[PDB]
């Protein structure tokens, strides 16, 4: 038989690549990384401009329904 | 008694199951890568009771 835990495709369309999660995680870096030049003012927080698309691909393509 | 023997209740019954148907479913696818393939487981057996 089937299962009762899924069968609605609700969490897949909400927490996925083609949803709204990828938009709320791309603006959080510029909200704090682009304003920390007051006290620090050093080239340090620049290694996060490429790991955003990588972390979302190594976690969503694990199962894939 | 000494004229006619009264009947007594009696029952049996049997629930037999043949083949199974298982279915296938598965187918395939795967993714993762590888593987797946387708075978048917799926068989799914049934109880005879
Ligand atoms: C050089 C790129 O930035 P980081 O690797 O964060 O530098 C480590 C030290 O804080 C240098 O001051």
DSSP string, chain A: ---SS-SS--HHHHSSTTSSHHHHTTHHHHHHHSSTTTTT-STTTTTTSSHHHHHTHHHHTSS--
Query: How far is the centre of ligand 1, averaged over its atoms, from the C-alpha of A57 (Å)?
Result: 27
| CA B27 to mean position of chain CA atoms | 25
- Separation CA B28–CA B30 (nearest Å): 7
A45 CA closest ligand 1 atom index: 6
| PDB resolution in Å | 6.2
Query: How far is the centre of ligand 1, averaged over its atoms, from the C-alpha of A46 (Å)?
Result: 10
Q: What is the Cα gyration radius of chain B?
A: 27
Question: In 10 A of CB A34, how many CB atoms?
Answer: 9
Residues A15 and A21: beta-carbon distance below 8 Å? yes
- Separation CA A64–CA A61 (nearest Å): 6
What size, in residues, is chain A? 65
Read off the tokens for A32. 């704090």
**Torsion angle defined by CA atoms of residues B8, B9, B10 and B15, in that order, rounded to the nearest 10 degrees:** 170
In short, whether A41's Cβ falls inside 6 Å of ligand 1 is no
Query: How far is the centre of ligand 1, averaged over its atoms, from the C-alpha of A30 (Å)?
Result: 18
**How were these coordinates obtained?**
cryo-EM
């Amino acid at each position: 038989q089937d299962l009762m835990a899924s069968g609605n495709t609700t969490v897949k369309a909400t927490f996925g690549k083609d949803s709204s999660v990828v938009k709320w995680v791309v603006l959080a870096e510029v909200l704090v990384g682009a304003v920390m030049y007051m006290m620090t003012k050093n080239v340090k927080f620049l290694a996060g401009f490429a790991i955003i698309s990588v972390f979302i691909a190594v976690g969503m393509a694990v199962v894939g329904l | 008694t000494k004229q006619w023997h009264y009947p007594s209740p009696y029952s049996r019954g049997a629930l037999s199951v043949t083949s199974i148907d298982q279915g296938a479913y598965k187918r395939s696818g795967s993714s993762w890568g590888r593987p797946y393939e387708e075978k048917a487981g799926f068989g799914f057996s049934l109880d005879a009771r």
